[PDB]
Amino acid sequence: TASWFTALTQHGKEDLKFPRGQGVPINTNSSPDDQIGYYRRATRRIRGGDGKMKDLSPRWYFYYLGTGPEAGLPYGANKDGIIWVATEGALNTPKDHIGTRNPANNAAIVLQLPQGTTLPKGF
């Protein structure tokens, strides 16, 4: 269970969020009804240089609605580390026909957004 897309890295202090209508990654292999889902924060820890564990910059992976680690959440559900995005005209239906990616036979799609998308500080 992998995201179809590469991650957004949060270098700043602000959690990811998008104005309504923005934030769905571009995917030419999906249609207007599909453009809806969530980002999920994935945090990694590493052995620091001084020996103590430390956090790396959080990553945010996009998943289509009804897929991925929170495949059961309905759109808009409040849950820490989960933020919601939807393009105008998407259908609030699970996207099982898109699903998630098997790295064995599909590279990640480099995450792109249409120009002029409003990113928070640090993304």
What's the CA gap between 8 and 104, in Å, rounded? 22
Does 47 belong to an annotated binding site? no
Instruction: Say which experimental method was used.
Output: X-ray
Does 44 belong to an annotated binding site? yes
- The answer to whether 86 and 35 have CB atoms below 8 angstroms apart is yes
- The answer to whether 60 and 10 have CB atoms below 8 angstroms apart is yes
> Phi/psi class of residue 107: alpha, beta or left (left: φ > 0; alpha: ψ in -120 to 50)?
beta
User: For residue 84, which phi and psi values (nearest 5 degrees)?
Assistant: -110, 145
Domain count, the chain: 1
Residue 96 is part of which domain span? Answer: 1-123
Q: Resolution limit in angstroms?
A: 1.9
What's the CA gap between 5 and 88, in Å, rounded? 20
Does 59 belong to an annotated binding site? yes
Radius of gyration of the chain, Cα coordinates, nearest whole angstrom: 15
Choose among 114, 102, 119, 121: nearest CA to 39: 119
Side-chain half-sphere exposure of 76, counting CA atoms within 13 A: 3
